Design a binder for these strands. Structure first.
Ligand SMILES: [K+]
Ligand SMILES: [K+]
Ligand SMILES: [K+]
Ligand SMILES: [K+]
Ligand SMILES: [K+]
Ligand SMILES: [K+]
Ligand SMILES: [K+]
Ligand SMILES: [K+]
Ligand SMILES: [K+]
Ligand SMILES: [K+]
Ligand SMILES: [K+]
Ligand SMILES: [K+]
Ligand SMILES: [K+]
Ligand SMILES: [K+]
Ligand SMILES: [K+]
Ligand SMILES: [K+]
Ligand SMILES: [K+]
Ligand SMILES: [K+]
Ligand SMILES: [K+]
Ligand SMILES: [K+]
Ligand SMILES: [K+]
Ligand SMILES: [K+]
Ligand SMILES: [K+]
Ligand SMILES: [K+]
Ligand SMILES: [K+]
Ligand SMILES: [K+]
Ligand SMILES: [K+]
Ligand SMILES: [K+]
Ligand SMILES: [K+]
Ligand SMILES: [K+]
Ligand SMILES: [K+]
Ligand SMILES: [K+]
Ligand SMILES: [Mg+2]
Ligand SMILES: [Mg+2]
Ligand SMILES: [Mg+2]
Ligand SMILES: [Mg+2]
Ligand SMILES: [Mg+2]
Ligand SMILES: [Mg+2]
Ligand SMILES: [Mg+2]
Ligand SMILES: [Mg+2]
Ligand SMILES: [Mg+2]
Ligand SMILES: [Mg+2]
Ligand SMILES: [Mg+2]
Ligand SMILES: [Mg+2]
Ligand SMILES: [Mg+2]
Ligand SMILES: [Mg+2]
Ligand SMILES: [Mg+2]
Ligand SMILES: [Mg+2]
Ligand SMILES: [Mg+2]
Ligand SMILES: [Mg+2]
Ligand SMILES: [Mg+2]
Ligand SMILES: [Mg+2]
Ligand SMILES: [Mg+2]
Ligand SMILES: [Mg+2]
Ligand SMILES: [Mg+2]
Ligand SMILES: [Mg+2]
Ligand SMILES: [Mg+2]
Ligand SMILES: [Mg+2]
Ligand SMILES: [Mg+2]
Ligand SMILES: [Mg+2]
Ligand SMILES: [Mg+2]
Ligand SMILES: [Mg+2]
Ligand SMILES: [Mg+2]
Ligand SMILES: [Mg+2]
Ligand SMILES: [Mg+2]
Ligand SMILES: [Mg+2]
Ligand SMILES: [Mg+2]
Ligand SMILES: [Mg+2]
Ligand SMILES: [Mg+2]
Ligand SMILES: [Mg+2]
Ligand SMILES: [Mg+2]
Length: 101
RNA sequence: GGAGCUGUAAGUAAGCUAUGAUCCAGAGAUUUCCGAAUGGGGGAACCCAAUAUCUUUUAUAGGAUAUUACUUUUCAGUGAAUACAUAGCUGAUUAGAGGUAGACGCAGAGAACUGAAACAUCUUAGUACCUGCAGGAAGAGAAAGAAAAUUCGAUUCCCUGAGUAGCGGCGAGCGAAACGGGAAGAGCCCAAACCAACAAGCUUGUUGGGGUUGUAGGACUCCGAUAUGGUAGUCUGUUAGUAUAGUUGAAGGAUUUGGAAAAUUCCGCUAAAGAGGGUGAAAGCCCCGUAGACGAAAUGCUGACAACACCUAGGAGGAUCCUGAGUACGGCGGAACACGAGAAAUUCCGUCGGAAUCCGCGGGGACCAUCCCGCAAGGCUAAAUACUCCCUAGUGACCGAUAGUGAACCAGUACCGUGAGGGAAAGGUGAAAAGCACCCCGGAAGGGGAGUGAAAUAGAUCCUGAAACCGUGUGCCUACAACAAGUCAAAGCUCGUUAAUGAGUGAUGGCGUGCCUUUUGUAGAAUGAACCGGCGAGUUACGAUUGCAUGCGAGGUUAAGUC
RNA sequence: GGUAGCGGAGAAAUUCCAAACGAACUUGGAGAUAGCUGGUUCUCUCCGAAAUAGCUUUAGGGCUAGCCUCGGAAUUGAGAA
RNA sequence: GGUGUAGUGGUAGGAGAGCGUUCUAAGGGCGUUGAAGGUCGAUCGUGAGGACGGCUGGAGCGCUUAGAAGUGAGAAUGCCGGUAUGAGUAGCGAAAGACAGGUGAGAAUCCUGUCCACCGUAUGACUAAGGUUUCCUGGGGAAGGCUCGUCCGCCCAGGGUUAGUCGGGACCUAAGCCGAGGCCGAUAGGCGUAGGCGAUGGACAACAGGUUGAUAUUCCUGUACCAGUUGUUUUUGUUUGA
RNA sequence: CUUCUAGUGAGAAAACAACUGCCCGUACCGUAAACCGACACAGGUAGUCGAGGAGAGUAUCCUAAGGUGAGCGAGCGAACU
RNA sequence: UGAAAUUUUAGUACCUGUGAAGAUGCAGGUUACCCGCGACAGGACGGAAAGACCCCAUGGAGCUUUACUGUAGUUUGAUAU
């Protein structure tokens, strides 16, 4: 996928539109990704999970990769990603600015 | 290729990964046992060996490795009745077995139902089935031809000839070929005569040279040339390309509704990319892609180049020699030719008889003569043609879960049968499991809250949720009535609609024997339907003919085929 | 263990051959053939029969004619009462 | 378009004109401000049929023109599915059970006890075939059990089959079968010699007791036997040679 | 298996000690609810043992060892079968 | 605990008559308050089996013979070996 673990991304669709967070986990096979503080769900968990209350836990659920855009670290704004080889190494490049990664 | 990964498949647990994992492509290694199965056996996936080497034990037992089936080819050694020998036996060597792709090809053998309105000739049909052999194609193929326009010049396939010529209990039916137009195109090798070498027993076998034909050719004898061209040869190299992974690949933000925007509105932007797919609803500009550009370490495949290899001669004379024998052909009996013995050619098989050979031979649909055409009894040969089990990329006025493959799902499965064999049913929560923590009744199941969700009457028998069938509640009617159940008339009561000279129910009165099929005639005591739902029957191809329509009109029109 | 369907076996009954044997079972030819029975799905408008003759291995089938329907041509109008 | 005249039952069947369904093309549209579909309504047309509104539903679908058909079902003792009727009816598959206690949410049906009753050339004890885990232990009550079930030959989880001597193989053969060469035959193959396979037969060394929840001539105890190897000792033969 | 020689032969035999001896089956049901009958089916299923009194007896009745009370019951005590 | 055959929908009387000639359903008259339970079997030409008897089809099959046409075998001759 064009987005990678640890990236800073902006949500461009969904209830969490315009939010921005770091990518916590990536699932290329599902073409999905998890962004901290994005698409949080209340989950009714029995206490069988080493938590002696079970409770209603809060966890981020994956969102489709197409619904996020990588944040330009140099500019702080979301942008599309091109691929340019720099000094013999292929890297991602911001189409808005040209900055790497 | 660059960040996750340890399948479906969650879960725990333990781990791997920028020292580049998982993943993708080429090559390679390992690849238990059964299975042609092949050391022997055997009720497949098991059992028991011999030989040689190694290994465990003090040693026997035990373990590993290698070889050991049958037949064919070749060689060698041994070796009977029997003397020589052969046969047998031993060893080595060589190449076969079996399966497929339910397809396509060739051949052996080869039905019946059916049609003929019966049936035997005939037709179904040389089809179905069985068997052998194959190749990527096969088969055919280089004239003892087609013709008689005078010519053509291997074969195959297509259009046409033509439903014609013909065949046929002259019935039912079967049914050509040549000419013409096209796809593709290619020609070559022996036997023989003759010469040389070799061995034996002047000829007689092997090898080599020579020769490959019908306007006759070759040998042979003279001359002159030792060239000119070609190939349907090679794991020979070089080169180019291509197949099998990949890389790159433009352009959008807000606004309104909404859980969610791609939808609406407003302004923009890209296009060699507005094919398509996905994304929380319908996206040219979010993602995967698309147009375009680029890319191969390794192995295949193709084409070119070279290399090697192999074919390649002209003219003149005939005196003689050669030019495919148990063959051609004939009788008899069958069969194939559209042609069923018919006047019957031509071709093939079985049996018997049985030629000529260049002044020769065969054919031109009995046969003879003339003329014309050709030269059998030897072999090989690419392309055009046939088919798709498979792999890749696509396409569809093709199906959309009773459809479409039997099989969208762990299907040739479950199940049935001794066996061959027969053969199902079964797709959909939600955008996302966020798959209902906690509480209450209950032993649980299952519910009621409370929560998740936009929606839970989307709660896993989960999208939608029809009808039959069942049940609850009730507006009206019903216990003196004989009812194909309705229809026409109608009081009463109840209710207020697509606002219509309304709706529901209905005491009571009149009339009135279902639907379908098949019948002269059916309410029929003739037939069929238990009910509901789904599925379920004049279609297509090629021809004939008529109507209608269009174009052209004494003209009309192309078929195959090429782009 | 042997005998297999154009067959086997039969102290013989058409008796048995995997719960139906005057010719087993399965697959294929195959969608056998059926002058026979059954079924054949929407609507309205115009018109509207026949159950007869002849022949038929023909009689509950078929063919021609007769009767119906649609289109067309032409007439010194030929039809009906 | 108007007036007039006439006509307008109908099976087989002929002619004409239309409705509706799926899909294709073009144009023009409609849809999370809710499509298709479902359901209700007292709506429109001459007919097949067409709208409109409410509710349900949640993503596709009309309209006009033309085109193509797997294009219309009520019947085929049609096929498949579902559900009725008979009907809370037949049946619940040879026979003896009773009570007390226990367990349990729950007991005629499970466990224990007592009495009673049944079989006893069997309904007892061994075994071959066959079945193939049904055996034991601990749980369970969804489904199966013709009732019930706390229970089971059911379901879940673990566990269980110990051989020189028993049966079979490393032993033998009968019938039958296979069959090197071979004989025969359109193909395929048929038959068959040597040689093998093949028991239901022949040959062959261990028995008693004990032990577990489940195995026992298998494990253990005791005492044996059969075949063989190494070693020690004592014998005796070394080629007129055991 | 026992003999006979043919062949083969330098080592054999006895006692004792120690040691070796492979593969498959082994559960369970088995005149049945576990097999064949679609069923937890009144049928079929080879062989062995199969006691006592009376008795010829494995007949018959009642019993031993041992096993079992049959997988719907409770009432009532009509017709009819 | 829990089926089945059957089943066009049924609010499912009698007599006489009528009718495809043997009516629960049609005509006339008569009878009959509504719903059941236990019994019987006259009818629903009751259910079950597309009658086997009879006829028909230019159907099938098995069998017979001095039906027709063939044919395996058997035999005889010519001919090849
Ligand atoms: K084998
Ligand atoms: K194929
Ligand atoms: K025939
Ligand atoms: K006929
Ligand atoms: K060829
Ligand atoms: K023709
Ligand atoms: K005829
Ligand atoms: K030459
Ligand atoms: K998106
Ligand atoms: K798109
Ligand atoms: K290459
Ligand atoms: K002929
Ligand atoms: K010629
Ligand atoms: K829903
Ligand atoms: K009601
Ligand atoms: K009335
Ligand atoms: K009848
Ligand atoms: K008999
Ligand atoms: K039906
Ligand atoms: K029922
Ligand atoms: K009922
Ligand atoms: K238990
Ligand atoms: K034995
Ligand atoms: K045992
Ligand atoms: K006695
Ligand atoms: K006794
Ligand atoms: K019981
Ligand atoms: K009683
Ligand atoms: K009685
Ligand atoms: K009648
Ligand atoms: K009766
Ligand atoms: K018969
Ligand atoms: Mg083997
Ligand atoms: Mg016929
Ligand atoms: Mg090949
Ligand atoms: Mg792009
Ligand atoms: Mg936009
Ligand atoms: Mg012929
Ligand atoms: Mg001849
Ligand atoms: Mg000739
Ligand atoms: Mg002539
Ligand atoms: Mg000539
Ligand atoms: Mg070719
Ligand atoms: Mg569906
Ligand atoms: Mg299907
Ligand atoms: Mg709903
Ligand atoms: Mg639903
Ligand atoms: Mg009265
Ligand atoms: Mg009253
Ligand atoms: Mg009649
Ligand atoms: Mg009926
Ligand atoms: Mg008789
Ligand atoms: Mg029988
Ligand atoms: Mg046929
Ligand atoms: Mg639709
Ligand atoms: Mg249809
Ligand atoms: Mg129906
Ligand atoms: Mg009753
Ligand atoms: Mg009982
Ligand atoms: Mg007795
Ligand atoms: Mg048990
Ligand atoms: Mg237990
Ligand atoms: Mg029960
Ligand atoms: Mg043999
Ligand atoms: Mg035991
Ligand atoms: Mg035992
Ligand atoms: Mg009368
Ligand atoms: Mg009467
Ligand atoms: Mg009436
Ligand atoms: Mg009857
Ligand atoms: Mg009949």
């Amino acid at each position: 996928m064009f987005v990678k673990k640890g990236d800073k991304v902006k949500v461009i669709t969904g209830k969490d539109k315009n939010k921005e967070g770091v990518v916590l986990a990536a699932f290329p096979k599902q073409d999905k990704v998890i962004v901290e503080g994005v698409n949080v769900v209340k989950k009714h968990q029995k206490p069988n999970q080493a938590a002696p209350q079970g409770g209603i836990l809060e966890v981020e659920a994956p969102i489709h990769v197409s619904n996020v855009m990588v944040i330009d670290p140099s500019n702080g704004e979301a942008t599309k990603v091109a691929f340019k080889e720099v000094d013999g190494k292929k890297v991602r490049v911001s189409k808005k600015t040209g900055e790497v990664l």
